[PDB]
Amino acid sequence: GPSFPEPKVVRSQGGLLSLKLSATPTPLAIAGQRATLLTYGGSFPGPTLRVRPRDTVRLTLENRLPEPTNLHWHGLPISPKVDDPFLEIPPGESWTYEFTVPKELAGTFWYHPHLHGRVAPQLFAGLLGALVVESSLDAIPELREAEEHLLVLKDLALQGGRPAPHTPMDWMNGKEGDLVLVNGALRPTLVAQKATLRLRLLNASNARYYRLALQDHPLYLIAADGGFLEEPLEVSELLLAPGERAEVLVRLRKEGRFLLQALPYDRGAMGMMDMGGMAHAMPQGPSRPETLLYLIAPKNPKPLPLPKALSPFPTLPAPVVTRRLVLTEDMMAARFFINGQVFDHRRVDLKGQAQTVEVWEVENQGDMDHPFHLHVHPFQVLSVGGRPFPYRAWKDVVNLKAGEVARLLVPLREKGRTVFHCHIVEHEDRGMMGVLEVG
Ligand SMILES: [Cu+2]
Ligand SMILES: [Cu+2]
Ligand SMILES: [Cu+2]
């Protein structure tokens, strides 16, 4: 097949994407070995769904797992009666998700389980896939003529031909694997045919971070989690926390081989040490560097000019309330809290008003990085750690290092009951989640 593996794409037809997926244990070949993973549609990653604004999506999920499951349409501003974080599909049963893609929407989104207490093992085992919303902006020459690829960044560990089980330390840290894969492949080669690449990036890992850097090249950020930036932003590296997405343009500068790497990054994961009676927690330190793929540039590359503008960011109404959400940890108990509480599906934690704007101040008072995710209502990051954000774009995950405060502008869209949580999904399963009701 093609040198660069990417998930199979399913496109809407005549305004309708109608599809049956099964969640199923699936034998397959992965990184040169045979393993049984949990997949959607028989593949790892699951199929990429590619739609346009105002399309109808009709997705029937059949549960062929031994435990209940559901779907979270991560990043999609739709109703929480569709993107329902409390729904359980029992083993053997099916459920049809039907929604209309919002008119003002573009970017890379994804789907994965969200059944509280079971997310981390199900996602680690392989249950995830991407959803791409095409834009009329994709027709401007500087994007249309680029070579486009999706990169699903997800790691894995195998034991006895199956995903490795979670240990107690995994529930504390979030589980990372030794197989650091791109689209389920081990260090694939991308032989570029054009000098400009448009790369859609998705961190679908449980807990691993990707401090992205391409050898000898900057990256040009053109989209965040849930939409385009207003104009391209040149960066020397790009950190992608669990659940985040980004789109970048790569402008290949000369012939040759360039490594795309995940550079060392210390997210605050912990180990245990005994040095003379004391048996106490100790920082794991930064991750070891990983090569994600080999990028081969074509002959005499002459990249396209960058687009001068992308999409103007909406002017938001003035906000009507400020919220403060504080994250804390009990590492040795593997318990995680928001404003001193663990998740309770019966307890509403915040009550807001549809079509108003709120300011959310999220403060990480723990020692680990925590990537904070809000369902249903995309937000604008104003600042993190007291530093103003260098662009305007819709996001739905924001990473917080130890001590940092994020100030978010949160327009409330669809009415109903939804959730916010850490997207180190082990921390969500262990309690770091709360309930927002919009009325
Ligand atoms: Cu998610
Ligand atoms: Cu969620
Ligand atoms: Cu967390």
Side-chain angles (χ1 to χ4, degrees), residues 151-154 180-182 199-203 208-221 223 235-241 244-248 250 259-265 287 289-293:
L151 281 67
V152 181
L153 311 178
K154 188 263 191 274
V180 180
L181 308 179
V182 174
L199 305 179
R200 305 183 182 257
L201 315 167
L202 163 63
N203 185 346
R208 179 174 289 272
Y209 281 60
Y210 300 87
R211 186 183 161 216
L212 293 176
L214 178 61
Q215 275 180 337
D216 211 30
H217 291 76
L219 309 173
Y220 297 93
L221 185 64
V235 301
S236 61
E237 63 180 56
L238 184 62
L239 185 71
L240 212 71
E244 286 187 313
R245 290 87 66 210
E247 301 190 9
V248 300
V250 172
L259 306 183
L260 178 63
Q261 291 177 292
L263 297 179
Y265 183 76
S287 59
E290 303 282 353
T291 291
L292 298 177
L293 57 76

Side-chain angles (χ1 to χ4, degrees), residues 47-321:
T48 297
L49 313 180
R50 201 183 167 98
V51 298
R52 303 199 333 158
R54 315 195 73 160
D55 280 352
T56 295
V57 174
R58 191 172 294 147
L59 194 296
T60 299
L61 179 64
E62 181 192 23
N63 184 8
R64 311 199 266 124
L65 310 175
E67 53 187 88
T69 196
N70 69 15
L71 282 180
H72 172 38
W73 297 91
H74 184 127
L76 287 176
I78 58 177
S79 169
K81 320 300 292 180
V82 177
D83 181 30
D84 184 348
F86 312 106
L87 172 82
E88 295 196 353
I89 309 169
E93 299 299 307
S94 296
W95 182 262
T96 298
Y97 296 92
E98 182 167 348
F99 60 91
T100 299
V101 179
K103 171 167 169 292
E104 290 295 323
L105 192 63
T108 304
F109 307 84
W110 64 303
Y111 58 93
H112 69 77
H114 190 92
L115 204 154
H116 173 68
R118 317 177 197 271
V119 177
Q122 290 188 14
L123 174 66
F124 194 79
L127 290 164
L128 70 309
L131 183 146
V132 169
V133 182
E134 296 199 323
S135 183
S136 58
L137 200 61
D138 298 327
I140 72 172
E142 300 86 345
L143 299 183
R144 187 64 163 98
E145 296 301 310
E147 171 177 331
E148 179 179 334
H149 297 283
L150 168 68
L151 281 67
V152 181
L153 311 178
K154 188 263 191 274
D155 58 335
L156 187 63
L158 292 172
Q159 182 176 302
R162 298 188 169 276
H166 269 67
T167 70
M169 182 170 295
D170 289 335
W171 287 111
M172 179 187 70
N173 287 321
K175 184 171 188 68
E176 299 180 61
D178 64 290
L179 303 168
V180 180
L181 308 179
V182 174
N183 298 331
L186 182 69
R187 298 187 285 271
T189 301
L190 198 165
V191 181
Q193 296 179 74
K194 295 172 170 294
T196 295
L197 308 175
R198 182 209 184 150
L199 305 179
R200 305 183 182 257
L201 315 167
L202 163 63
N203 185 346
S205 304
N206 282 41
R208 179 174 289 272
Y209 281 60
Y210 300 87
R211 186 183 161 216
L212 293 176
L214 178 61
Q215 275 180 337
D216 211 30
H217 291 76
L219 309 173
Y220 297 93
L221 185 64
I222 64 168
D225 301 334
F228 289 110
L229 277 58
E230 299 190 287
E231 71 193 352
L233 179 72
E234 179 181 78
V235 301
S236 61
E237 63 180 56
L238 184 62
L239 185 71
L240 212 71
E244 286 187 313
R245 290 87 66 210
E247 301 190 9
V248 300
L249 293 171
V250 172
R251 306 181 79 242
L252 295 169
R253 68 202 309 262
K254 63 191 174 181
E255 299 180 19
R257 181 208 76 160
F258 305 93
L259 306 183
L260 178 63
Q261 291 177 292
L263 297 179
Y265 183 76
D266 187 351
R267 71 185 180 87
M270 301 295 292
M272 295 294 293
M273 177 194 292
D274 178 7
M275 290 282 156
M278 55 173 75
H280 55 330
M282 301 288 294
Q284 292 193 3
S287 59
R288 73 185 289 270
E290 303 282 353
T291 291
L292 298 177
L293 57 76
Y294 305 96
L295 177 51
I296 309 299
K299 320 284 159 291
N300 298 290
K302 295 301 179 300
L304 309 162
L306 289 166
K308 291 305 303 290
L310 298 159
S311 195
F313 191 77
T315 307
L316 298 180
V320 304
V321 65

